[PDB]
Design a protein around this ligand. Structure first.
Ligand code: NAP
Ligand code: DDF
Length: 159
């Protein structure tokens, strides 16, 4: 199955590394737990933002152009990206917006972190039919000495 994992600021705004200001080690732990030993698919801009492969995961990068880094696997279409994951229980799609838009209709699960942070940005997580999705887990945390903002983890499954 295909899953999307994303961090959503106020108004479901999404973005890249330098554009997302919070410091949420708890969310990084959540992301790691939920993606480790699974293939991760990302767009080229997300790849450039991260700057180095995510360890212990197959990193698959979408780009219309030839690859430019042998440390990751490069593909030129959504269907090629999925095929490059092989036969695994769960494929993790880690954005960005253009990639989320394409994979959402194919996805069975969403892993969302709803962060109580107001950020500059025009880009939002794709609109999806709320009635298409059942919330199966959520867990709220206030900010603390390590985490700059309050945040809520949520898993939704397609119903
Ligand atoms: N300044 C602003 O107001 C503003 C607003 C919104 C976004 N942005 C910028 O936009 C970028 C983030 O956009 P994003 O989150 O949408 O990026 P993303 O999903 O991480 O990456 C998009 C890239 O992935 C590749 N890709 C996606 N689908 C593909 C497909 N089906 N086949 C082949 N390649 C595919 C393309 O790479 P190739 O280009 O290599 O073909 C595409 O340009 C950042 O650089 C951000 O700064 C800026
Ligand atoms: N839950 C979640 N949080 C986020 O901030 C993001 C998503 N999802 N999805 C898309 C994008 C992912 C950004 C992103 C980039 C690098 C690492 C990373 O380096 N993670 C390491 C652990 C880092 C640490 O332990 O400090 C990892 O091994 O997963 C995590 C997230 C932003």
């Amino acid at each position: 199955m295909i899953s999307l994992i994303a961090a959503l600021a106020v108004d479901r705004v999404i973005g890249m590394e330098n554009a997302m200001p919070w410091n949420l080690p708890a969310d990084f732990a959540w992301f790691k737990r939920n993606t480790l030993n699974k293939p991760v698919i990302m767009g080229r801009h997300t790849w450039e933002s991260i700057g180095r492969p995510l360890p212990g995961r197959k990193n698959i990068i979408l780009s219309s152009q030839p690859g430019t880094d042998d440390r990751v696997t490069w593909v030129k279409s959504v269907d090629e990206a999925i095929a490059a994951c092989g036969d695994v229980p769960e494929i993790m799609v880690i954005g960005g917006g253009r990639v989320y838009e394409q994979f959402l209709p194919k996805a069975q699960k969403l892993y969302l972190t709803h962060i109580d942070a107001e950020v500059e940005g025009d880009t939002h997580f794709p609109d999806y039919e709320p009635d298409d999705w059942e919330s199966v887990f959520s867990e709220f945390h206030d900010a603390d000495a390590q985490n700059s903002h309050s945040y809520c983890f949520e898993i939704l499954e397609r119903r």
